[PDB]
Amino acid sequence: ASPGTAVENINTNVKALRKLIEAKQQDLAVKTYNPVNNGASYTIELSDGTSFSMYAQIAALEGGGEDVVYSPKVGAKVEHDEYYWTLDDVWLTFENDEKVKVLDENNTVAPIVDINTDGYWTVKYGTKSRTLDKAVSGKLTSQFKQVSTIGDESVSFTFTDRTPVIELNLFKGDNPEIPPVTGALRRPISPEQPAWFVHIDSWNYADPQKIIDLIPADIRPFTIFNISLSVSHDEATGIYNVSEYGYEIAKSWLRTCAENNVWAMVQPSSGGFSHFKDVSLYSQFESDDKVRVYDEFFREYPNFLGFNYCAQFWGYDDQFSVSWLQRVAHWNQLLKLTHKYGGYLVVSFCGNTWSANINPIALVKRNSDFAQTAKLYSENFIMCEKYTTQSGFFNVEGICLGTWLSGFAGQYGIRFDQCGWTEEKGQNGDKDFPPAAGALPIIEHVMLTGQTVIDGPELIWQQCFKETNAVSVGDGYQSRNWECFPQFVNINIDMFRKIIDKTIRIPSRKEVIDRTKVVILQDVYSGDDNAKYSSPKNLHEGLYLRDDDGNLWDNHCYFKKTGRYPTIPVAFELCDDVANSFQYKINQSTFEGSWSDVNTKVGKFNRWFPQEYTGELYAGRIENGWVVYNGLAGIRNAAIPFKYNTCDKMELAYSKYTVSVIKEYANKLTFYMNNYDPSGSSKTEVIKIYGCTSKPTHSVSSRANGTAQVSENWKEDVYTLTVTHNGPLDLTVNCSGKATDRLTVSTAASIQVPASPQIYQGAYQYEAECFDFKNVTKRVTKGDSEPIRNYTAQGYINFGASSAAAVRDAVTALEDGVYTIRIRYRAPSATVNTVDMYINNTKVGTPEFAQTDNDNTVWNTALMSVSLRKGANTFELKANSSGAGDLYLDNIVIERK
Ligand SMILES: [Ca+2]
Numbered sequence: 078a079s080p081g082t083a084v085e086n087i088n089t090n091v092k093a094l095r096k097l098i099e100a101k102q103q104d105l106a107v108k109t110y111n112p113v114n115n116g117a118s119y120t121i122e123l124s125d126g127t128s129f130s131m132y133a134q135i136a137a138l139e140g141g142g143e144d145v146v147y148s149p150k151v152g153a154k155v156e157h158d159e160y161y162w163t164l165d166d167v168w169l170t171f172e173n174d175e176k177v178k179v180l181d182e183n184n185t186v187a188p189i190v191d192i193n194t195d196g197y198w199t200v201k202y203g204t205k206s207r208t209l210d211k212a213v214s215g216k217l218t219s220q221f222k223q224v225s226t227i228g229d230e231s232v233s234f235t236f237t238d239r240t241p242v243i244e245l246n247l248f249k250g251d252n253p254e255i256p257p258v259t260g261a262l263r264r265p266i267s268p269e270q271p272a273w274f275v276h277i278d279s280w281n282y283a284d285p286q287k288i289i290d291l292i293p294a295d296i297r298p299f300t301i302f303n304i305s306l307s308v309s310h311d312e313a314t315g316i317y318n319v320s321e322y323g324y325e326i327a328k329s330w331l332r333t334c335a336e337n338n339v340w341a342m343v344q345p346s347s348g349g350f351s352h353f354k355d356v357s358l359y360s361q362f363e364s365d366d367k368v369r370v371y372d373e374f375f376r377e378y379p380n381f382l383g384f385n386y387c388a389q390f391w392g393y394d395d396q397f398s399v400s401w402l403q404r405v406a407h408w409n410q411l412l413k414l415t416h417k418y419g420g421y422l423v424v425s426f427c428g429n430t431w432s433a434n435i436n437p438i439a440l441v442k443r444n445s446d447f448a449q450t451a452k453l454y455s456e457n458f459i460m461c462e463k464y465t466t467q468s469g470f471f472n473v474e475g476i477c478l479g480t481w482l483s484g485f486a487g488q489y490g491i492r493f494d495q496c497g498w499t500e501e502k503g504q505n506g507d508k509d510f511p512p513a514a515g516a517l518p519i520i521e522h523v524m525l526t527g528q529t530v531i532d533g534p535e536l537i538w539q540q541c542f543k544e545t546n547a548v549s550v551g552d553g554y555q556s557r558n559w560e561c562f563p564q565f566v567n568i569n570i571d572m573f574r575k576i577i578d579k580t581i582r583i584p585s586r587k588e589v590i591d592r593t594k595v596v597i598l599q600d601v602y603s604g605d606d607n608a609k610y611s612s613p614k615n616l617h618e619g620l621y622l623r624d625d626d627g628n629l630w631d632n633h634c635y636f637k638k639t640g641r642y643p644t645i646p647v648a649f650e651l652c653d654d655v656a657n658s659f660q661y662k663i664n665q666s667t668f669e670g671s672w673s674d675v676n677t678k679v680g681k682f683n684r685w686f687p688q689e690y691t692g693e694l695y696a697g698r699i700e701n702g703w704v705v706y707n708g709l710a711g712i713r714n715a716a717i718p719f720k721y722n723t724c725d726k727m728e729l730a731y732s733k734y735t736v737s738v739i740k741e742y743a744n745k746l747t748f749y750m751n752n753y754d755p756s757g758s759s760k761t762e763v764i765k766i767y768g769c770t771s772k773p774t775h776s777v778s779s780r781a782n783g784t785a786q787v788s789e790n791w792k793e794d795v796y797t798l799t800v801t802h803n804g805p806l807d808l809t810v811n812c813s814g815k816a817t818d819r820l821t822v823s824t825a826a827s828i829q830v831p832a833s834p835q836i837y838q839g840a841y842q843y844e845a846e847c848f849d850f851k852n853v854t855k856r857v858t859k860g861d862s863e864p865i866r867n868y869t870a871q872g873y874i875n876f877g878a879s880s881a882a883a884v885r886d887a888v889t890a891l892e893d894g895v896y897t898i899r900i901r902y903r904a905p906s907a908t909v910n911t912v913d914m915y916i917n918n919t920k921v922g923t924p925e926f927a928q929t930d931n932d933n934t935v936w937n938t939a940l941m942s943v944s945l946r947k948g949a950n951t952f953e954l955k956a957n958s959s960g961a962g963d964l965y966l967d968n969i970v971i972e973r974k
Pocket of ligand 1: 868871968
């Protein structure tokens with residue numbers, strides 16, 4: 078398992094040292110190397126295709142000891158031209174002061190350290206065996222210190238004993254250069270080019286290909302795939318488990334994304350925890366071998382847009398995280414890099430009382446240098462509200478909005494999360510989170526407050542996608558299978574389609590500012606953290622706070638009671654002329670004196686925002702569009718006088734959690750309505766139209782998997798539509814009256830299909846844990862709890878020794894020609910030569926799966942050149958007879974020859 082043991086780590090380091098001395102003698106070069114868990118460990122790849130781990134941190138000995146204690150230090154030292162093993166810096170000997178050569182030349186045998194049944198350290202070499210000192214519980218030091226690049230042409234391995242530095246050539250002679258995409262935004266986001274962050278999640282143990290393929294073709298160009306690395310880790314050591322090898326996951330899945338010509342981001346962090354080391358200086362992105370990842374993904378993937386730091390409110394100042402200040406200083410640098418490559422930095426925030434001093438006000442109010450950079454590169458910076466915590470939704474909404482309106486962030490987004498549902502009690506007597514509830518804030522904030530990014534919804538593995546049982550796909554083979562949850566199809570996909578088809582017009586920043594009129598400026602420097610960084614305690618009271626709900630951290634519900642008033646933005650400073658065009662600017666310092674009196678505030682706000690309806694439904698208007706929803710139990714009503722339609726008014730009676738987008742025209746009304754229950758319950762809505770001078774007509778069509786039936790009634794000059802439905806529908810109503818006092822409708826929203834990435838010309842990758850399979854020994858889809866280390870993405874398979882074993886994958890090529898297939902494999906007990914490769918159902922040869930070193934971290938690379946055709950190709954490995962031993966398969970990599 079991924080925490081390793083002391084013995085395991087020790088013996089991995091000895092095997093590494095043998096390998097380095099072999100490489101030195103044979104003049105092998107280092108092809109790649111990569112720190113993990115902040116350099117607690119490294120994965121190394123040499124130019125013969127051997128890969129292995131090295132540990133800079135050793136796991137403690139069990140027993141809970143807290144002191145640093147003895148462990149055997151097995152090093153190596155040159156004598157008359159030959160390396161021989163050392164033990165605690167004397168020659169390692171067993172019997173007759175006989176020294177032991179590091180290279181036995183026909184073996185990979187190396188000293189093995191162990192602890193015996195008597196509790197004593199041992200070291201063995203072949204059949205020879207030596208008992209050392211009694212082990213004692215505690216912390217250990219490593220024999221290995223660090224690996225570092227020296228120049229840009231050499232790699233040095235440093236040890237902590239008297240073992241000499243081993244220097245190896247850095248392999249350089251790869252393909253010619255693929256120049257990076259720089260300058261302009263790689264993928265503009267705006268009201269016209271909204272984005273959906275759809276997650277490829279470690280918790281789904283994903284095949285990235287199968288998640289991408291779940292997204293409909295019309296949605297895909299507007300999708301950015303968010304490669305999500307769990308920060309689940311071992312408490313004692315901080316070592317990541319669920320996403321054990323984050324860099325490798327992100328790299329594999331980014332390749333698959335680039336191959337599929339879809340836009341992608343990497344999410345390495347929730348809270349303080351991050352798979353990648355934070356920087357403090359820009360220079361590090363090119364000069365610092367511990368943080369290669371950041372420049373690398375931008376440089377090598379034209380579809381890569383940058384890094385998403387989610388839920389930035391928890392987990393700081395951990396032994397294995399950073400301070401929030403360090404995180405911001407990281408962002409200061411990463412924003413510059415993002416800018417160069419035309420990407421985005423995404424941050425998302427959810428609050429509680431203890432995270433006020435690190436919220437989006439604090440972000441700029443406490444960090445002047447960061448604030449400068451954010452303002453300078455606001456187009457590359459995206460701020461998102463997150464619905465994860467139990468309270469403060471309006472507080473956090475207003476502050477995140479504020480960051481964008483004020484000029485610090487270039488876009489604003491929502492990361493909706495089921496976890497916001499109030500624990501124990503829920504809302505409206507609904508203990509369990511109903512998916513339909515989540516449509517309400519998203520539609521509201523997108524259409525009324527100009528969010529251009531939707532993220533999730535969370536939890537990904539309960540609201541978007543799930544792995545099912547493997548499915549039979551014919552020919553003996555079985556296949557891992559992922560499906561969308563029904564709510565994803567009937568809420569989130571269908572909603573985004575309403576943005577694309579121009580029903581849900583997203584307002585521009587300037588449009589939001591002109592509608593909003595008022596901003597709070599957080600200019601308090603005295604009192605506690607909430608006084609200095611949070612919005613006024615009672616800002617929302619008497620406005621859109623529900624009667625049953627509390628202020629600030631007692632605000633448990635994100636359904637607004639009315640839409641008379643816009644979301645009130647709370648900002649630190651107004652950075653540009655657009656920010657400074659706010660009609661009303663209230664300094665928060667003056668809030669206690671005047672505005673803290675709810676009635677005074679309501680009076681002022683009532684003059685700024687006219688009453689445009691009555692009733693208990695939420696209704697909010699922007700141009701000829703309404704967002705109307707029922708956030709309460711029961712069927713609830715509104716009376717809404719038309720502003721564009723030539724009839725008089727409508728009365729609405731809506732079921733609980735029904736949301737609607739209503740477009741008024743002079744002689745027409747459209748209604749997009751949703752209320753999706755996966756369990757298949759129907760809801761009733763009633764719509765009454767007053768003041769039609771002739772009988773109206775209607776048409777309806779249900780959307781996605783919705784059912785709908787609509788009946789009409791014409792009597793007493795009132796047109797009544799009853800709508801019974803589960804899920805989404807579009808209803809058109811042709812109604813007209815004699816009103817002349819009405820506004821005029823604008824031309825239709827522009828929606829522009831976002832252009833595709835530049836075509837990726839790099840190497841493709843396919844994980845063996847994602848292959849179709851039959852008669853394999855074991856499939857490790859979750860590698861952290863198993864004994865093999867140093868794998869790519871989240872797993873590997875033991876293909877095994879059955880004569881009927883076989884794996885298959887669909888791979889692609891840009892054009893016909895010869896490609897090299899690198900097969901990453903273990904064969905620890907014997908050479909496997911009974912396994913044939915088939916390309917497009919034709920045998921092309923038998924890979925040499927030469928016997929690999931016995932260490933649990935060691936993988937090797939077998940190579941085959943094959944002809945691929947343009948487009949989809951079939952790759953298979955098939956046993957022809959029983960294997961001489963187990964074959965492990967991690968991945969294949971394919972590149973043009
Ligand atoms: Ca793998």
